[PDB]
Structure formats: structure tokens, C-alpha cells
């Protein structure tokens, strides 16, 4: 019988998601990889237990995570029932619809049919009465935004999601989505964009829009899929040189490169949380350990920018 | 155990229903005839299986289809449970209320009482939690349109229908119905009118209204009840001459007359789908085969119009 | 096993309730008396069966009908389950809250607490998922009208009543109630006032207001509690003289006095239905027999008015 | 088997809560103390039975009452099932969320997550389908007021609370909360502030705001936690002198000091009810006995004010 | 959230109940007193948690335990749901019917109506699908033993009790009851008699009968209602016994519990407790369970007043 | 969506289990290894689908199979719901209790409490209303055999198991168990013993007893834990046996499975597998099941070291 570490809320920093009542853990765990039927459930279980023990209260899923599609939700559902049920109200659990889940015209994209039918499937797979956050997973250019937004509003009003969010929406469209949801009376809680030292698109307008609108943000691929780790220490030659120079700065800060890379995403206090992936419990411990040194000075930021813009 | 043809989504074209997230199959199957207790369930089952195998994802019912009334919904309900349940989220299932279903003042027309009580009966007969589209089946001149429209809005808000539509509404009234639904916040998805080479009323204003308003359309009786088929090849004498001349043009196009007649309804890309009836699986294969030649040139359209306006 | 008379919809006239989709039987049956534990269920059963056999599709209850309070709903609930369940969708069943039902501050009047808790009790006693019409039974001068009206709106939105109405509301207050309900989006279907040859208050403004607003009406005590019957043939002396003179006019019309008295309430086509009480099946047959002569000429109306204004 | 005293509605005065349909007992019983696992259930049961027998129809709980947290709701739940279920519709039961209930970021404060998850827990512990009043227990300065207010509106619309209220809100913020709720369409029923002879903050603006807005009020700690009782008769020396002088005035009125202190809170007819705590049935009898002399003259009010402002 | 001590099975002794598959802890906890609505649930909860943490896997209830009647079952039911549900299959939970529970002729004694209706009420109060052991709580001298025994047989066959027992049955009647249940196909698992240094009647035939028949035994009031403790003519015996306990390095209560289990003749002792320390004291008896012939002779001498 | 091979019943042999109505596939699949949380569900799913596609209709589980204990039942439960539910009435699913499953005196061995509580847990993990066969997994030398057998009888009468069996029971004890179950009215369907070319103890009396009593048999570890495969003094025997298999046109594993079923004396062989090819190899043994007296004499010679 699993018993959550009694010190878990001392080990983690919780950050308010935009202008809302929700505080997310600075580090959240994504189930994008390592929770399907091609990996071992013993390991999946160990990752979730380690995460909650360290104070990670947010687990992010999607209908099609696995492989195969739906298996991450099923495995999470089993582990939730077996180990976490007494603490479900201490967790923020998300899922999504918007990429390809099942074959045919109703198993992908942004229709009301797909969003409603898919959340019903997700709730069944996970064994939940509701999710905390339901996302539209990517934009659908060919479906009216109001249909998709009204499906999100309907799912909140009917108690299948407490809050809703959007993912992979460029700034212009995000603005439209946010304003529609506000008008419907179910405000967008959060935006999930890709953001790391190596992918800074959100700094071109998205982050400022979200701050304007009171919407939170949770960065995915914050380690640039593993590039911002020890992987290439012990990609292009220019990339490798950048990774070595960033790693030296991380060492100077008493951090692994991955730790500095996670800390850096929260450096301006305009991103709420970082969503990590993990295949082994030590990667979760390392991520949470980033909190020992979150601060970046102006000098450190300039040093990093010069490394990133460096050609030699 | 029925297993849907793995190539089904390669065999069919899916068309967006107005401005919405719903794509209907170019060919939909109606259960108006051949699904009641006066025909054989073995045949009914074969028709539904053949249809889905060819990519037809939309099955259109109504409360009073049979005979007797309600039997098409019951037979569909049984076949759905036995053969299609794992694929229910790949299907668009519709039903309707508005013609005579049961005796007395609450079993016909457009009252809130009849629409709500009838959809509850339909959901029970079909064994469904909700239908994808619920229609008001014909106008009710003596009930305020707002009562009927609010009943549709209520059924969507309370999760018994994902979308709503109207059938047999002339253009002026359709405009009023659409605008009311828009104001209530549950937009009309679709209009179901009668339309074929021999019944072109919708070209007098309805089709343009629906395009203006972003509402889709699904044509019923597209073969003019069997007249636009091989039936009279191997009605009036003038009709017969038209059928022979249209059949010659269809042969020139590598098509049966029925195939050309279905293709013709979608020729201007201002109708979403054609709703066919069938008594045998070969009629479903023939209908889907129309997709091999959907295109009509200006010259072909003029040739057809001249045949239709011909007196000798 | 009871089987409803196959000719029932030939025997009755159905009248549209204001501007709505609901047609009520010209004669409705009230369960105000003869359905409690102080009378015999065999008789109660016979009355309901006779009524439906003659085409009476509307049965009107209230929480406190009996005696004791709640017993009419229980007896109706049993008879409905035993005899009428297959035909529930052919019936309009109403109940009400607003007079004294249980002791204490929450068992009377017009609070949201009382209306919601009382309809839940009524639905349990009757064994129903919803009533067709739920009424506020009388005004509550000390509770804000908007609280009571919002409770009615909430019960419709949440599917416990298909429609709502008000009873015993004077015209000024009825106007306020109607306008509030319209603004909330759940329009008042019907008003239930006392109206007979001997109680004509509604002709002082109420009937014109209801016609203005598209609201129907159902008259209770249309026989002035039994005075407009054979009771005093085979009260004051002036009353008795009026009853004899009205009875002579009824005989001239081929009617019993009670038949003419019911017909008279519908004479101007500004009242929807008359709500009768009955202790024996013959009184229901007599009431429905009034339909053989509903018409009143200007001359007959003047003759009646002169009798009513007569002092000698 | 407990049977409620047949004279209970003769023994108590019921007072309208602001402009609403709800009349609260002049004396309500709070379960803040003496209903957890550190006291005896026999005593808890005796207190609730005595209270209802005397006409106290309102029992006020909160998620974290005990100790331990949740135990008062559980003990109340058991006693309700065992003894009070036939009379649940004669009771007003409240609960709250807003102080610390469970560990972590979702178990305290004012988020939609916490309010919804906590009311679901409360309904389970108490064995109820809904509470009569659900409160936000204290302000949350860091969560947008609209999120918290919309959670209250959502819980009413979805039938988990009949009415909502706020507690411990200063006047400025109370005004904002009230106006938001009005705009959402679920008006604030009641405000629960601390108020007694020794804590008169509400007279600085709150009571006038509530009267302006039609919102009721229920005073907690009306005996200043036991100071306004016999406790110090048979704190500071200045306090003690005040208690002796107030006690002499109470004796002159034929009252215990606690009785006068409760009566005084309702003296201006601008507070709805007083919420008492009790550890033994005699304290409930004493409280209800205050009703024998509720009236205060201008002279008595000046005498009390002079005692309160007295330094010697 | 309570978590059972991981070492709970490392020290406690488990003893097979007659010839059966059931091993009871040498010390079992009874809920006869201190589990009703007149004592604080915080304490009741602490007693159950301390007991299971020390390896006590058997909790003994009855319909009328409280006070008021039924409250011990309700309080236990709540604590079970809240704290113990994941470990229910590690517990042996008993209840009983046979004393006064409700008013009137069907709420006491030995009829099939009372036993069946009572176990249904107990299962509801405790929130259980079945009890591990259901007992007839005392003999009824006027209802045929076959009716009562058939009610026990019916309850096991219908899955409301895994096993049945009898309590307070004198030896001759116990023999009859045991033989009837064996014939019906639901053998008697266990007998619950009063037994202690001061109440040795079971040594006059009951214990030998149970051995003969393969039926287990669980002694109630093993400390003679608290007389065999630090709490105090019998006072002279208590003093003398306490001096022998002292020489054995034990509390008198510890020696008194050890004495009941001196032979494999008794399966378990059912203690009462109002405080966790009393449970800790009882489990500590395990450290010195042996008695020499000299010690037994000395005990008898003290008991017979020599 | 998985669709069972339409030819699945065209090649597999089915063998009647003693004197009963049950015919087991000649090759059955056990879930002892490679179905827990330490191996990938994708592979487990592929093994079950390949097995049923080849006509293997019997899947054998136990409460503690995994690791961890219970996970094989959970994973099987999930795959059953997802892929096999329409064909559940074409499957024989077994489970067992009798080894260590949970901590404490009620989570192992032979008591009625453990067997009943354990089958309830297994039915929940697997999402089944009943198993086809429930086994006592090993003998318990201290719980009366009647108690254990009556728990089996009770579970069948109450519809949680269609049939019962015993596993790992030596012949003399199996005789007693079989006779007790016959008397109770729920006859023993099947015995599951270890048997292979290297473990022939069942030929010393067990097989004859089962024939006499009409009870079937399903051999476990038929490849002696993988020794009778391509994986390798016994190594000299493995080499010599493999040369005989080669002359027969078979893999050693194939000849080893065929040998266990050489006589109608054994109903089925329960194989383990980590890859689908191992299942395919086992089913291929059906192509050469016969042994001449010369071949048997040659095998014995090899076995006895001549
Ligand atoms: C991190 As993604 C590919 O699920 O938006
Ligand atoms: C095709 As029709 C008569 O159901 O509108
Ligand atoms: C006819 As009445 C007294 O129920 O309004
Ligand atoms: C009386 As309070 C501390 O629950 O607001
Ligand atoms: C210990 As007793 C009096 O309940 O048998
Ligand atoms: C194959 As076995 C050790 O589970 O009997
Ligand atoms: Cl909605
Ligand atoms: Cl990453
Ligand atoms: Cl609605
Ligand atoms: Cl057609
Ligand atoms: Cl509402
Ligand atoms: Cl009348
Ligand atoms: Cl809402
Ligand atoms: Cl106080
Ligand atoms: Cl029986
Ligand atoms: Cl004792
Ligand atoms: Cl005693
Ligand atoms: Cl049985
Ligand atoms: Cl093997
Ligand atoms: Cl082995
Ligand atoms: Na994403
Ligand atoms: Na139509
Ligand atoms: Na009325
Ligand atoms: Na408060
Ligand atoms: Na006893
Ligand atoms: Na085995
Ligand atoms: Zn909700
Ligand atoms: Zn919905
Ligand atoms: Zn509804
Ligand atoms: Zn409600
Ligand atoms: Zn059972
Ligand atoms: Zn059965």
C-alpha cells in the first residue's frame, strides 16, 4: 500500500495559474511517453508515486497518449484506483482532444461530436467523474472556433471538466479563443505551448497576451526533447557547442543542465509550470531539485542569450 | 461477429456540413423504408453492415419509421447493440419528431411536450444515451416557433442530442428558425429538404439561405422515389422520355442513372449529403459507386436542364 | 387490465392553451376531492378510467390534496402505475405548491426551498420523472416574486416540469409574474383562476391580460362548488331563483344545468379548459356531454346576464 | 425512536432572511464545537434533538468542523439518518468551504476546484443530496472573486445547494460579492459575521449594506465565546466589571446574561438569527428562553452603551 | 491516513482455532465496552489502530454492544470504512445475536427470525458483506436447538457469515449444538466462554469436549473484569498472585492472560481496553508465557486459600 | 479491434478432461510468467491473441501470478475486456488460492476464509462473474481437508466457479480430496501436477488414481522450466533427446510436449511463453504425436543414463 510522503508539500513550490484560484506545481508530469503498453507498468507506477511524493500534484494526459492510443489513460486509471484514490482531490488531472484518436471524420480535430465523445471515453478509461482541466489539443482551422469553444463551455457546465485550456494555439488565434470563452462565461484557465531554451516562439507575443488576459501557461518539451540534458555530453556541431557552454553555466550554479533548463523557463514569472517527461524516477528527482536554484540574474540571462546567438 | 471493412474510410468522401465541425458521408442511409417489422431483419442487418463497410457513417431515422411506428428505431437499436457498439463514436445517428407518432394531442406536431417525450422514447428504443442530430420533422404552423426551438435547445443543453436540425421547412420559416436557434445559443446544424432532378424547389432560395447562414443540407428522395433508376427502363410518357435521355447521359459518363442522379444533387457544392433508401445491398454499392464520377461540366448541366424542360 | 376506449379522441375537443404547443381537453379532471384516504380507491380508479375513456387527458393535482395531504398524489401514483403507464405520454399531469403542506416555515408559501423540496416529494408520491405542469398555487406577498419565479424556471431547466403556471394570482401580480418568467426564458404556460356563472372576477381584467400575453387558463369551481347542478332543484332564496331560471334555459338547450354552466365558461373562446370535480363516473359523462351544445348566442348571453342581475 | 416535540413551532420565532423566501429560527445551532470525535455522540445527539424540539430548524456546519476535520459532518450525517430523515424538509442545513480542510494547494481558500470538491465531500459525509445553504467561509484575496462566485452559482444551478452565502467578508468586498452574484443570477442569501455586545464591527457599515441589498445575516460568537455568560460571575478587570453590570441589567429583565446578550443582537431587526454553540442541552433551552423578552427600549440601549464605553 | 505498522506480524503469536483453518491472535480485542456513543470516537479509533499495529487481527462485537445497543457496531463500521478497508481481508470480525436487542418477542433469544433479522441489521451498521464469525450469544432454553442451529447454517450457506460459533453454552448443551451443526454441514468453529484464574468452570468438562470435537475457544473476561490488574479476601489472592507475577518479571494482568493460554487448550483471550497502554500490556504477556509445575502448584495453593 | 482467426478450431486437438463434459486444448497457456507489471502489456496481449488464434481456449492464472501478486489477473482482466469479451463463453479461465497472496494468517494456505476472500478478489481483478475452474493451489498439512473442500463446494454452489480442481496434491491426499468432493456433491474436475520427461513422479500412482476416479490432468512445467528446449550431465540427456527429436522431424520442445500426452493418461500440457513463436512451436507438436515402442525404449535408455 502506497502512502504519499508526508513532506511532499514542503518540497515543492506552487504557482498561481494566471488570474485564477489554481496553483500548479512548478514541475508537472506529462504522460506523453512511458505510460503506454510498450513500457512496464511497474515503472509507470514508480514514476507517479515518486512525483506525488515530491509534491508534483499535476499529471497531464491526452486521449491518444500511449502507444497504443488510450493506453496511458488506462494505465493511469488503474494506478489511480489502486494507489491514489484517497488523494484524488489533491491532484490536478488533465486530458485533451484535438489530434488523431480514432479513424474517420469524428476521431480527430475540433468538432463538438469529437470533443464530447472523446472526453466521455477518457473519463471511462481513467475511472473519473471529471477531469480538472480539459484541453483542445491543437487548432482546427476548418471548424468554426465558436463550435469548439462552446463544446468546452458545455463540458464545464455539465461537470465533466472543472476548467478548460488550449494547446498549440498561436497568439492571434489564442486571443480569439480566450475572448470567445470569456463571452460564454467559462474563461480559459491555461495555454500549453512548446517552450525551452531552444524554442522561444512564445516570447514573440504569446506570453504577453496570456499575462494581459490572466491566463496561465505550462511549457512542454522544456528540455527540447532531451537535448538539454547529459545526453550529448557524456545534433549539429553548433548545437553541441551551445549545450556544452550552457552545461558549464549550469555546473557553476550547482545544477545539472536539465535543472538549469527547467528553471530558465520560469525565470520571468510569466510561465506557470514546466511539464517534464520521464522514463525513470531519478529524472523526476532531478527536475524537482531545480528549485534549489531558480533565480537568474540579468548577467546570467545575457550570458545565456549570447551562447544561444553564438556561431563559434 | 461483424467486423467493419478496414478500407471503409478510403471508399467515401466526407463533406463539411455548412460552417460546423461535422463532416457527413457524401452518401447517407435513411431508414424510412425496409427497417420495420414488415421486412426481414436479416436484410436490415445486411444493409447497415454494407453501408458502414463502404464508409457510410450516417444513419437517419425518425420516431415513426417502420411500419409500425417505432419499429425501425427498435430494429436499428438491436443491430447497433449486436454489431456496432464498439464503433458508435464513428457514427452520426439522427432521429426526429414532428409527424404523427402516437394518438392524441401530444403525439404529433411541435410542442415541447411531444419533442421531449418523443426523444426519450427514441433513445429507449435505440438504446442510446444521445443522438447526434435531433430534428423537428416538419413545421407546426399553430405552435409558436420559439416553443419548438427552445425544446431543441433544451435537449442539446441537457445532452440528449449533440446537434439539432429542421426538415421540410420552406425558406422564409427556415430563416426564422435558424435565427431563433442562433439567439438561443444552439445553432441549427442542418436542413433536410426533398431534392432531386425532378424536384428542384430548394434552388428557389433555400440553398442560398443555408449557405448565407452556414447551415448544411441533406437531400431526401434524391432518386424521386425510384423514378431516377432502372425501374422504368428495363409515370407519364413525358417523364419516361426524360428518364431515357438522362439515362443515356449517365451511360456516357460510365454511370447508372441512379448514380448520376445522386452525383447531380452534390454538383454545386451547396448540398452536404444525399440520403438514399435501399432494400438490397447492391443499391448501397451502386450509390457509393457514384463517387467515381461526381463532376458535371457547364455543358452537361445545360444538357440536363434542356432534357428537363423538354416537351418532345 | 384496463384498456383505454379506442374512441376517446373522437369524444373530446382539444383547445390550444394560449400561444403554446399544448392543447388541453375542454374538460379536465381535478383531484381536489375524492382521491384521498377518506374515499374508496375503487371509486377513484373508476373516475380516472372513465375520464381517459372519454378523452380527458389532463389530471390536475396539488401536493396537499386528500385528505390527508399527499394522499391524492399517492393514490393517483398507484393507479398510474397499475393502469396508465403505457399511456403516460398521452397525459398532461399537473401538481402545485403554495398552500400549507407540512408544518413549519418551509412547508407553505413561495420560497425556493419549499417549491423544490415539494416537487421532489410530489414526483416520489406519483412515481413520475417529471410533471407536465408545475404551479405556484397562490401568491406569497412576503417573498420576492423573482425568487418564486426563478424556482419555477430552475425546475423546468432541470427537467422536473415541462411547463409552469400560476394559480389564484390577481391580474396586476399575474402580469408581473408573466413578465418575470418571460425574461428568465421559461414562459408561463397557464393561469388557474376560480370562474363560473356565479364568480366572474376574471372578466374584470385577467382574461384580457392572459389573451394579451399568450397565456392559457383553466377555470376551477366552474359549478360554483355544486350550486350550478341539480342539487338545489331536486343557498339563498335569490340564488335558488337564479338556479331555477338558468336550469330552464339549460333544459331548452337540451342540457342539464351543470352542462350549460361548463359550456358557458368556454363561450368566448378566452378560457382554455374547465376543471371539474367528481365523486361518481356519471358526473364525468355529464361533463363531457356538454360538448354536444357549446354555443351561446348573443341573445342567450343577455338572457343569462339578466337572470344573474335579477333580484325578483 | 426520536419523535420531534409537537409544540416545536409554537416555541420559536422565525425571521425572514433579508428579501427572500427563507425564514430562519431566531436561534440557530452551530456545530463548530461539540460534534467531533473528541466529544461523545450521545451528547451530540441530545443537543440536536433538544434543538429541533424547541423549534431550532437551522443547523450550521463547515467542512473542517470537528476535530478532526470532517467529523462534525460525519456525526451529523449519522444522527440525521438515524433520527431526523422524515423531517429533513423541515430543516435548513448549511456547510462551507474556505478555511484549511486538506493539505496542499487545493484544500483551502477560494478556488473553483476546492469549493466543488469540498461540497462533494460534505454531501457524502452528511448523506445529503444537497445543502440548503453553501458558504464561502472567508475571503480569498489572491483568487479572483468572480471565480469563487461562479463556483457558488454553478453549485446552485446544478442542485447541490439551494442557496449560497458568504462569511467573514468585510463590507467593501461583501458589496462586490453580492453584486457579482446578482449579475450571475444566483443572489447571495446571507452573510455570516461575528457580532456580539463585545464585537460591534458590523455596525460600521455591513449591516446597512445588507439591508440595502436584501441580504440576511446570522451572527456567530454572539456570547463572545462564553464571556457573556455566567462563566466569570460564578478576562480583564474592565471586562469583568462590564459583565457584572450587563448581568445586573439582564437580571432586571428576568433574563440570564446570555439570554440578554442573544436578544440584544436581534434588537434592531437588522440581523436575522443568532448562531449559538452548546455543549449541553440546558444551554439550548436557555437560548430559546431569550424569546420571552426580546425587546430593548431606547433607555436600555443607552444604559448598555454607557456600560460598554465605561472605564470605571 | 492510517498505515498499519509494517512489523505487526513479527511478534504476535497466532493459534489455530481447534481443528480448522483459522488462526486467531493469542490476544483478541473485544468491543463490549468503550466503543459506544458514551465514549469518544477518537479513543475508540486509537484502540483499534494500536491493536492491529500490534498484530491483533480479531475484533469481537455483538449487536447490542454500546451503549446504546448497536452503537459499537456503528462506530466500528465508520472506523473500518475510514481506516481499515484495504486490510479487511486481514481481519476476523465477529458479531452475535441472543441477548436483548430490540423490544418485543422477536428481539431477543434464539429464534430464526431474530438471528436472521439481527445479522442483517449488524451487516448494515458495520457496512460489511459478511462477518467472519456469527455467534448465538447465549442459549435459549425454550426454542428448539435445531431451529437456532439451522439459522446459523442458513446464514453461512447464504454467505452472510464465513463461520459460526456459540457463546455461553454449558458443556452438555454445547455437545448437542456441535453435533447438530456437524450433521447440517456447517461445523461449529468456536466457543466463547468466560474463563480466568477466578472462573475455572470450563476446566470441568467444556475444554475437554472442545478438544474432542475440534472446536476452538476464546476466553472472555480473562482478567476477571479488571480484578486481575493493578486496580487492587480476593484482595489477598490478588496480592499473592501479583507477587508471583513480580518474580516472573510480569504485571499481574500479564501473568493472568498467560495463564489462560498455558495449555493449547484455549485458542485466544479476548481483552477489553479503555486505553492503548492496556493493549500494549496484554501483548507484552507474550514475553513470558511458560509456567513450571511448581508455579502452577503455587497458583492453585493461592486460589484455594492455602 | 482484434478478431479471432476463423480457422482457430481447424487444427487444435481437444481432449476430454477425465470423465466430464470439459474438453481442454491439448496445449493450454499459463500466465505464471510474462503477464505481470514487469513485462510489457503489448507482448502479453500478443501472446493471448496468438494463443486463441491457434485454438488454445484455456488460460490458467492464480491469485499471486505477476509480479507483483495479482497483476497477471489484472492485466488479463484488461485484455479480456478490451479484446475477448464476445468470446468469453469459448474460454476456460482458471484461478487458484493456496500460496502466499497477502500478509498475515488469512492470506495463504487452506482456510475457508482465504479461499473465499481470495476468489472474490480474483473475480474483481479479472472482471468476471465466475471462473471456469477454481483450484486449491497446494495442500495445507494443518487445515482439515474437509474445510478446504467445503469452501470449493460452496464456491461452485454459489456460482463463483463452474468447476473446481486441486494442484500439487500427492496421490494419497488427492484420493482423500477427490472422495470428499464427490461426497459433498461437487466432484473434482481436474488435478494440476508437475510432469515432464525429467519429472516423472506422477507415473508412480497419481495418473492411475486420476484414471480410476475420472479426474482430468494438466501438466505444468512440461519443458522442465525451459531445459527441454534449444536453450542448451542433463546437458548430455538434452543433446541425446534433441537428436531423437531431429530424427522425428521435430524441435526438442515439440517432442517433449508430445511425450507428456503420449497416452490418454494426461489431458493437456500447460506451457509458458514470453514470445508468440514459442506458442506456435508448441502447437506444431501436433504434427507428430506418436511414439513407437522402440522410441519410448530409446527415451528411457537416455533418461536412465544407459
Ligand atoms: C506535447 As503534445 C505533441 O501532446 O502537444
Ligand atoms: C423523408 As420524410 C416523409 O421522413 O420527411
Ligand atoms: C382549487 As384550489 C383551493 O386547490 O386553488
Ligand atoms: C465561526 As467560524 C471560525 O467557522 O467563521
Ligand atoms: C462478554 As458477554 C456478557 O457479551 O457474553
Ligand atoms: C505452476 As505453480 C508453482 O503456480 O503450482
Ligand atoms: Cl450547455
Ligand atoms: Cl523535454
Ligand atoms: Cl434548458
Ligand atoms: Cl429516392
Ligand atoms: Cl437553473
Ligand atoms: Cl365546481
Ligand atoms: Cl453552471
Ligand atoms: Cl458564543
Ligand atoms: Cl439454507
Ligand atoms: Cl477482563
Ligand atoms: Cl459476566
Ligand atoms: Cl453452500
Ligand atoms: Cl516449462
Ligand atoms: Cl516448480
Ligand atoms: Na500539448
Ligand atoms: Na425528413
Ligand atoms: Na388552484
Ligand atoms: Na463562519
Ligand atoms: Na460472549
Ligand atoms: Na499449479
Ligand atoms: Zn458541477
Ligand atoms: Zn453534454
Ligand atoms: Zn429536459
Ligand atoms: Zn435543482
Ligand atoms: Zn459464499
Ligand atoms: Zn449458478
What does this structure look like?
The structure is cut from a larger assembly and holds six copies of chain A. Chain A is an alpha/beta fold and 312 residues long. Chain A has a single domain (14-312), classed as NADP-dependent oxidoreductase domain (TIM Barrel), CATH 3.20.20. Chain A has ten helices and ten strands. Chain A has helices at 41-53, 71-84, 112-126, 145-157, 171-184, 206-213, 237-252, 257-265, 281-289, 298-309, and strands spanning 14-16, 23-25, 27-30, 58-60, 92-97, 131-136, 161-167, 188-192, 216-219, 273-276. In chain A, the strands form two sheets. In chain A, strands 3-4-5-6-7-8-9-10 form an eight-stranded parallel β-barrel, surrounded by five helices. A two-stranded antiparallel ribbon of chain A has the order 1-2. Chain A is globular. The A-B interface holds A 102-107, 109-114, 116-117, 121, 140, 142-144, 147-148, 150, 154, 158 and B 8-9, 14, 16, 19-23, 57, 89-90, 92, 132, 157, 159, 162-163, 185, 214. One chloride ion binds next to loops of chain B. It is classed as oxidoreductase. The entry lists the keywords funded by the national institute of allergy and infectious diseases of NIH contract number hhsn272200700058C, predicted oxidoreductase, essential gene, Salmonella, molecular replacement, Structural Genomics, Center for Structural Genomics of Infectious Diseases, csgid, oxidoreductase. Structure of IDP01002, a putative oxidoreductase from and essential gene of Salmonella typhimurium.
